[PDB]
């Protein structure tokens, strides 16, 4: 996750094993109930899409409900390239590039990327725009059970 410190600098720091054990033992209980979606939002405050993916990574052995939420993540992916189709390159040199639907979803961009952009002024908010397409996967799936 990115946290601001007492002097207002943006620090990354990598995802706690505390917050990995919590999430999955809120999911061994609550999987298919509507609290999941506050307690993934709980345990995701400030987090990087690779903190995410981290986060996804802990929970996959339940493949039907885990192809439900990476098929959610390429339709938003697919929706925010269709609103945002990339560009050659950035505006000038020194500019961060506009990313992609697999650069918020953390597949094709580097941890330095998402930093980059979670800590631009104002921020790109790329950890919180895969986090709405998480919660929408995740709201899939509770509907369906
Ligand atoms: C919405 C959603 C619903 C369900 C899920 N995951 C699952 O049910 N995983 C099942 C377990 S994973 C591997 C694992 C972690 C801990 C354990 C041990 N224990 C089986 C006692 O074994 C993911 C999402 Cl994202």
Redo the contacts with the bound molecule.
């Keep these: 996750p990115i946290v601001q410190n007492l002097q207002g600098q943006m620090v990354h720091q990598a995802i706690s094993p505390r917050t990995l054990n919590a999430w999955?033992k809120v999911?061994?209980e609550k999987?298919?109930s509507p609290e999941?979606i506050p307690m993934f939002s709980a345990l995701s405050e400030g987090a990087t899409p690779q903190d995410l993916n981290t986060m996804?990574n802990?929970?996959?052995?339940?493949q039907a409900?885990?192809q439900?939420?990476k098929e959610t993540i390429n339709e938003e992916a697919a929706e925010w390239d269709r609103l945002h189709p990339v560009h050659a390159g950035p505006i000038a040199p020194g500019q961060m590039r506009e990313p992609r639907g697999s650069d918020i979803a953390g597949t094709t961009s580097t941890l330095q990327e998402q930093i980059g952009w979670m800590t631009h002024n104002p921020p790109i908010p790329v950890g919180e725009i895969y986090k709405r397409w998480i919660i929408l996967?995740?709201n899939k799936?509770?509907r369906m059970y």
Aim: glycine letters at 16%; charged letters at 5%; zero cysteines.
């Design positions: 999955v999911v061994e999987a298919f999941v996804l802990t929970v996959g052995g339940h409900a885990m439900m939420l996967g995740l799936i509770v």
